[PDB]
């Protein structure tokens, strides 16, 4: 369970590891759609989540449109949560899960999803 007091998403309760926290809702686009709409893929637009872990198929969720409190989640190199996917009725949904236990009143963060650090390589 979560809570947002910019606004910051925070654990409402001492969550256990691997706990479903919140769905990242918004408009789903493949990379090509995002680029056709005029935006650059994996550059840090506010309220946009980039996700590449569904079998290498690059997509994003634009939460300027009917998003929820999940759009407020900040990125961190030391995150306590992660984006996971599931298929429901042939539609992909993205959810934020805890990576380990999260004390109540701790900010919920996920790993950087956009091109940060200006690196030559990545792991």
Numbering used by the authors: 24 to 28, 37 to 154
Which of the paper's sentences describe this entry?
To better understand the molecular mechanism of human MLL5 function, we solved the crystal structure of its SET domain at 2.1 Å resolution.
The SET domain alone (residues 323 to 458) crystallized in the space group P3121, and diffracted up to 2.1 Å resolution. To allow crystallization, we mutated an exposed and non-conserved cysteine (Cys 453) into alanine since this residue caused heterogeneity of the protein due to dimerization by formation of an intermolecular disulfide bridge. The asymmetric unit contained two unliganded MLL5 molecules which superposed with a root mean square deviation (RMSD) of 0.64 Å (110 Cα atoms). Accordingly, the shortening of this helix results in the formation of a long loop (from Gly 372 to Phe 381) that is very uncommon in SET domains. This large loop between α1 and β5 occupies a groove which, in other SET domains, serves as a substrate docking site. However, contrary to MLL5, the elongated loops of these methyltransferases sit outside of the domain. It is noteworthy that this MLL5-specific loop conformation is observed in both molecules of the asymmetric unit and does not rely on crystallographic constraints. Indeed, the β1-β2 loop is disordered in the crystal structure, suggesting a high flexibility of this region.
